[PDB]
Amino acid sequence: PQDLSEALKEATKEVHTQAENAEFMRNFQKGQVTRDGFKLVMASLYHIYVALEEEIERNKESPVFAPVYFPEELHRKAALEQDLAFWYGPRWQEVIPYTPAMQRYVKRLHEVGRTEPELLVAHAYTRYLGDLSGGQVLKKIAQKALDLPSSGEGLAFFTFPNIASATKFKQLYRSRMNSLEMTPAVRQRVIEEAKTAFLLNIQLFEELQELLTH
Ligand code: HEM
Ligand SMILES: [Cl-]
């Protein structure tokens, strides 16, 4: 479509559906998810966000990203750090897994943020808006499947405290995206990257399923 936020949504509808149907993901939604499986996803999210957020902090000033820089409303590293301390304990940083699929997603994120930051938005959109959209559902699922204690910890990731209305925020984010100024050449690179980001998630899910079935 015309608006970037639309072109993105439409250009990734296919890969997005593949993501949904990925065995691991498909099972998660079907309510079937183990703690180890859940821990693997959380550990993955931590790594991905740590990388993504580092790159965002590096290019926040650039015009290629500034318009969609919403640190307070979206940052997840800290939330994830709280959750992993709960899921893996006080030395989670020294025990959480860091698999190849994860490693590869991180690598691309740093590649983008270092050499082609104009593509960073493709990842911020993919991750933030995706997690913001599916967050409420997935939470209740793992909340019902895992049956965690009353510790009052472990799921901070599913709550963006600095965002009152997900809907209104998404509207604002999309708008800032469409306001993002880029040449058509770049716009196409951003679209591709978004498909890449999905693929990366897909590879990731597939690898986790593989690890779990063993
Ligand atoms: C349990 C699996 C999943 C289901 C069933 C699912 C379902 C949905 C639905 C129904 C929406 C809301 C559409 C809207 O608000 O217009 C959405 C949006 C989104 N999802 Fe997923 N999703 C899942 C997994 C993923 C994954 C793995 C990614 C990629 C990491 C992803 C990224 C996104 C993005 C970027 C959006 C926003 C698209 C836009 O701008 O309109 N989703 N998803
Ligand atoms: Cl809402």
Short mmCIF file of C-alpha atoms and ligand atoms in Angstrom, two decimals:
data_model
loop_
_atom_site.label_atom_id
_atom_site.label_comp_id
_atom_site.label_asym_id
_atom_site.label_seq_id
_atom_site.Cartn_x
_atom_site.Cartn_y
_atom_site.Cartn_z
CA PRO A 1 0.00 0.00 0.00
CA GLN A 2 0.93 3.67 0.24
CA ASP A 3 1.48 4.16 3.98
CA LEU A 4 4.58 2.32 5.16
CA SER A 5 2.69 0.74 8.05
CA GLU A 6 0.30 -0.74 5.49
CA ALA A 7 2.95 -1.83 3.01
CA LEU A 8 4.68 -3.58 5.93
CA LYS A 9 1.57 -5.34 7.21
CA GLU A 10 0.67 -6.55 3.72
CA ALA A 11 4.22 -7.51 2.73
CA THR A 12 4.59 -9.63 5.85
CA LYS A 13 1.13 -11.20 5.99
CA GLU A 14 2.55 -14.36 4.40
CA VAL A 15 5.61 -14.80 6.63
CA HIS A 16 3.47 -13.76 9.60
CA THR A 17 1.08 -16.60 8.89
CA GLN A 18 4.03 -19.01 8.59
CA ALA A 19 5.14 -17.78 12.01
CA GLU A 20 1.69 -18.49 13.44
CA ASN A 21 1.64 -22.00 11.97
CA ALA A 22 5.16 -22.81 13.20
CA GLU A 23 4.75 -25.96 15.31
CA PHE A 24 6.11 -24.37 18.49
CA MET A 25 4.02 -21.20 18.10
CA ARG A 26 0.99 -23.16 16.93
CA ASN A 27 1.21 -25.33 20.05
CA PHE A 28 1.65 -22.31 22.34
CA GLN A 29 -1.64 -20.83 21.13
CA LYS A 30 -3.24 -24.27 21.44
CA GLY A 31 -2.40 -23.98 25.13
CA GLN A 32 0.40 -26.56 24.99
CA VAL A 33 3.60 -25.01 26.35
CA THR A 34 6.05 -26.31 28.97
CA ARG A 35 8.03 -24.27 31.47
CA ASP A 36 11.26 -25.18 29.71
CA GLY A 37 9.65 -24.12 26.47
CA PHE A 38 8.42 -20.93 28.07
CA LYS A 39 11.83 -20.30 29.62
CA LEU A 40 13.42 -20.73 26.19
CA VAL A 41 11.14 -18.11 24.68
CA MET A 42 11.81 -15.68 27.51
CA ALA A 43 15.53 -16.25 27.27
CA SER A 44 15.28 -15.68 23.52
CA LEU A 45 13.28 -12.47 23.94
CA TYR A 46 15.86 -11.17 26.36
CA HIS A 47 18.70 -11.64 23.89
CA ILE A 48 16.75 -10.20 21.01
CA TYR A 49 15.68 -7.15 22.93
CA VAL A 50 19.09 -6.58 24.43
CA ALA A 51 20.52 -6.40 20.92
CA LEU A 52 17.60 -4.50 19.41
CA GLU A 53 17.57 -1.97 22.21
CA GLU A 54 21.33 -1.44 22.06
CA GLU A 55 21.06 -0.56 18.39
CA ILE A 56 18.09 1.70 19.03
CA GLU A 57 20.10 3.53 21.69
CA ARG A 58 22.83 3.97 19.10
CA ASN A 59 20.59 5.47 16.43
CA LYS A 60 17.86 7.18 18.45
CA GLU A 61 19.19 10.57 17.31
CA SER A 62 19.16 9.72 13.61
CA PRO A 63 16.27 10.94 11.45
CA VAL A 64 15.96 7.38 10.18
CA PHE A 65 14.72 6.31 13.60
CA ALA A 66 14.05 9.32 15.83
CA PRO A 67 10.39 9.54 14.84
CA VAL A 68 9.72 6.06 16.24
CA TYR A 69 11.94 6.33 19.29
CA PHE A 70 9.71 5.56 22.29
CA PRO A 71 12.13 4.35 25.01
CA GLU A 72 9.86 4.84 28.00
CA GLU A 73 6.76 3.32 26.44
CA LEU A 74 8.40 0.31 24.85
CA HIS A 75 11.66 -0.80 26.47
CA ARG A 76 11.59 -4.46 27.45
CA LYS A 77 15.13 -5.33 28.54
CA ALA A 78 14.49 -4.45 32.16
CA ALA A 79 11.15 -6.24 32.18
CA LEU A 80 12.82 -9.34 30.77
CA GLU A 81 15.67 -9.09 33.24
CA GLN A 82 13.13 -9.22 36.06
CA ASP A 83 11.41 -12.22 34.50
CA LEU A 84 14.61 -14.18 33.86
CA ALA A 85 15.78 -13.61 37.44
CA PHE A 86 12.54 -15.27 38.41
CA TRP A 87 12.67 -18.11 35.85
CA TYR A 88 16.39 -18.91 36.04
CA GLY A 89 17.31 -17.53 39.44
CA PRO A 90 19.83 -14.90 40.68
CA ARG A 91 22.54 -16.03 38.27
CA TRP A 92 20.32 -16.35 35.21
CA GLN A 93 22.73 -14.27 33.20
CA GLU A 94 25.27 -17.11 33.59
CA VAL A 95 22.80 -19.95 32.87
CA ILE A 96 20.20 -18.87 30.32
CA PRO A 97 20.60 -20.50 26.91
CA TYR A 98 22.06 -18.70 23.91
CA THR A 99 21.40 -20.95 20.92
CA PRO A 100 22.39 -20.49 17.24
CA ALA A 101 18.92 -19.33 16.13
CA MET A 102 19.06 -16.69 18.88
CA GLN A 103 22.65 -15.90 18.07
CA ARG A 104 21.75 -15.40 14.41
CA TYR A 105 18.84 -13.03 15.17
CA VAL A 106 21.14 -10.99 17.42
CA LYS A 107 23.83 -10.90 14.75
CA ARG A 108 21.48 -9.48 12.12
CA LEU A 109 20.15 -6.90 14.56
CA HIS A 110 23.64 -5.61 15.23
CA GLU A 111 24.43 -5.73 11.50
CA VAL A 112 21.43 -3.50 10.82
CA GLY A 113 22.11 -1.06 13.64
CA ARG A 114 25.76 -0.68 12.66
CA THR A 115 25.71 -0.57 8.86
CA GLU A 116 22.15 0.14 7.80
CA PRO A 117 20.21 1.74 10.72
CA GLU A 118 17.58 2.99 8.29
CA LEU A 119 16.38 -0.61 8.42
CA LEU A 120 16.14 -0.70 12.21
CA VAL A 121 12.50 0.38 12.06
CA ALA A 122 11.66 -2.88 10.27
CA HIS A 123 12.77 -4.67 13.41
CA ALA A 124 11.32 -2.28 16.00
CA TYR A 125 7.96 -2.50 14.25
CA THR A 126 8.14 -6.29 13.97
CA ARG A 127 9.07 -6.85 17.61
CA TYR A 128 7.35 -4.07 19.53
CA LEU A 129 4.02 -3.91 17.71
CA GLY A 130 3.95 -7.68 17.46
CA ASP A 131 4.51 -8.21 21.16
CA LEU A 132 2.19 -5.32 22.01
CA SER A 133 -0.57 -6.90 19.91
CA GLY A 134 -0.25 -10.50 21.07
CA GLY A 135 0.90 -9.83 24.63
CA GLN A 136 -2.44 -10.05 26.46
CA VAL A 137 -3.50 -13.35 24.90
CA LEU A 138 -0.19 -15.22 25.19
CA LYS A 139 0.12 -14.12 28.80
CA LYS A 140 -3.17 -15.67 29.92
CA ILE A 141 -2.18 -18.82 28.03
CA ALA A 142 1.15 -19.34 29.81
CA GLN A 143 -0.58 -18.07 32.94
CA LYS A 144 -3.07 -20.92 32.66
CA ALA A 145 -0.59 -23.51 31.38
CA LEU A 146 2.39 -23.02 33.69
CA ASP A 147 0.44 -22.28 36.87
CA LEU A 148 3.22 -20.20 38.39
CA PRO A 149 3.06 -19.38 42.13
CA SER A 150 1.88 -16.11 43.64
CA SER A 151 5.44 -14.80 43.59
CA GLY A 152 4.10 -11.85 41.63
CA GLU A 153 6.99 -12.11 39.18
CA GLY A 154 7.93 -13.74 35.91
CA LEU A 155 5.53 -12.12 33.46
CA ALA A 156 6.50 -8.47 33.55
CA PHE A 157 7.33 -8.77 29.85
CA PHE A 158 3.65 -8.96 28.94
CA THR A 159 2.87 -5.57 30.41
CA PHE A 160 4.03 -2.24 28.98
CA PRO A 161 3.26 -0.09 32.07
CA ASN A 162 4.00 3.13 30.22
CA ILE A 163 1.32 2.47 27.64
CA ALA A 164 -2.24 3.01 28.86
CA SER A 165 -3.95 2.19 25.56
CA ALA A 166 -2.24 -0.34 23.30
CA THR A 167 -4.60 0.68 20.51
CA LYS A 168 -3.97 4.41 20.73
CA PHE A 169 -0.23 3.78 21.03
CA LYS A 170 -0.19 1.50 17.99
CA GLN A 171 -1.98 4.29 16.12
CA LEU A 172 0.68 6.75 17.19
CA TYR A 173 3.53 4.36 16.31
CA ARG A 174 2.15 3.62 12.83
CA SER A 175 1.72 7.33 12.23
CA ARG A 176 5.28 8.09 13.24
CA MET A 177 6.33 5.26 10.92
CA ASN A 178 4.44 6.69 7.97
CA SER A 179 5.95 10.07 8.85
CA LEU A 180 9.38 8.48 8.54
CA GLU A 181 11.04 9.97 5.47
CA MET A 182 12.90 7.60 3.16
CA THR A 183 13.56 7.11 -0.54
CA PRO A 184 11.65 4.35 -2.36
CA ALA A 185 14.89 2.41 -2.59
CA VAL A 186 15.12 2.38 1.23
CA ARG A 187 11.40 1.68 1.66
CA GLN A 188 11.94 -1.56 -0.24
CA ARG A 189 14.93 -2.46 1.92
CA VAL A 190 12.81 -1.89 5.02
CA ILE A 191 10.03 -4.12 3.66
CA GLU A 192 12.53 -6.88 2.97
CA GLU A 193 14.11 -6.56 6.39
CA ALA A 194 10.66 -6.97 7.98
CA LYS A 195 10.20 -10.23 6.09
CA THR A 196 13.69 -11.10 7.29
CA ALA A 197 12.75 -10.36 10.88
CA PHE A 198 9.80 -12.73 10.56
CA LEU A 199 11.95 -15.45 8.98
CA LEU A 200 14.43 -15.03 11.86
CA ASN A 201 11.62 -15.60 14.34
CA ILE A 202 10.46 -18.60 12.36
CA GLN A 203 13.96 -20.15 12.33
CA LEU A 204 13.99 -19.46 16.05
CA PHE A 205 10.68 -21.20 16.79
CA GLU A 206 11.69 -24.19 14.69
CA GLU A 207 14.96 -24.51 16.59
CA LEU A 208 13.25 -24.31 19.96
CA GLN A 209 10.81 -27.03 18.96
CA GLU A 210 13.80 -29.13 17.90
CA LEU A 211 15.54 -28.52 21.24
CA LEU A 212 12.39 -29.34 23.20
CA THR A 213 11.48 -32.57 21.41
CA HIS A 214 14.81 -33.90 22.72
C1 HEM B 1 0.62 -17.13 18.54
C2 HEM B 1 1.04 -16.67 17.22
C3 HEM B 1 0.61 -15.44 16.70
C4 HEM B 1 -0.69 -15.08 16.41
C5 HEM B 1 -1.92 -16.00 16.44
C6 HEM B 1 -0.67 -13.69 15.93
C7 HEM B 1 -1.83 -12.92 15.70
C8 HEM B 1 -1.81 -11.56 15.37
C9 HEM B 1 -3.01 -10.72 15.24
C10 HEM B 1 -4.44 -11.21 15.09
C11 HEM B 1 -2.57 -9.43 15.15
C12 HEM B 1 -3.39 -8.14 15.26
C13 HEM B 1 -3.57 -7.45 13.91
C14 HEM B 1 -3.91 -5.97 14.04
O1 HEM B 1 -3.91 -5.45 15.18
O2 HEM B 1 -4.18 -5.33 13.00
C15 HEM B 1 -1.11 -9.48 15.06
C16 HEM B 1 -0.29 -8.38 14.76
C17 HEM B 1 1.10 -8.41 14.61
N1 HEM B 1 1.88 -9.56 14.79
FE1 HEM B 1 1.25 -11.43 15.23
N2 HEM B 1 0.65 -13.22 15.85
C18 HEM B 1 1.44 -14.28 16.33
C19 HEM B 1 2.83 -14.30 16.29
C20 HEM B 1 3.61 -13.28 15.77
C21 HEM B 1 5.02 -13.38 15.58
C22 HEM B 1 5.89 -14.60 15.86
C23 HEM B 1 5.44 -12.19 15.08
C24 HEM B 1 6.73 -11.86 14.70
C25 HEM B 1 7.81 -11.81 15.68
C26 HEM B 1 4.28 -11.33 14.98
C27 HEM B 1 4.31 -9.96 14.63
C28 HEM B 1 3.18 -9.14 14.52
C29 HEM B 1 3.18 -7.74 14.07
C30 HEM B 1 4.36 -6.92 13.55
C31 HEM B 1 1.91 -7.27 14.14
C32 HEM B 1 1.43 -5.87 13.73
C33 HEM B 1 1.05 -5.83 12.26
C34 HEM B 1 0.43 -4.50 11.84
O3 HEM B 1 1.15 -3.48 11.85
O4 HEM B 1 -0.77 -4.49 11.51
N3 HEM B 1 3.13 -12.04 15.34
N4 HEM B 1 -0.64 -10.79 15.22
CL CL B 2 -6.36 -1.52 24.33
#
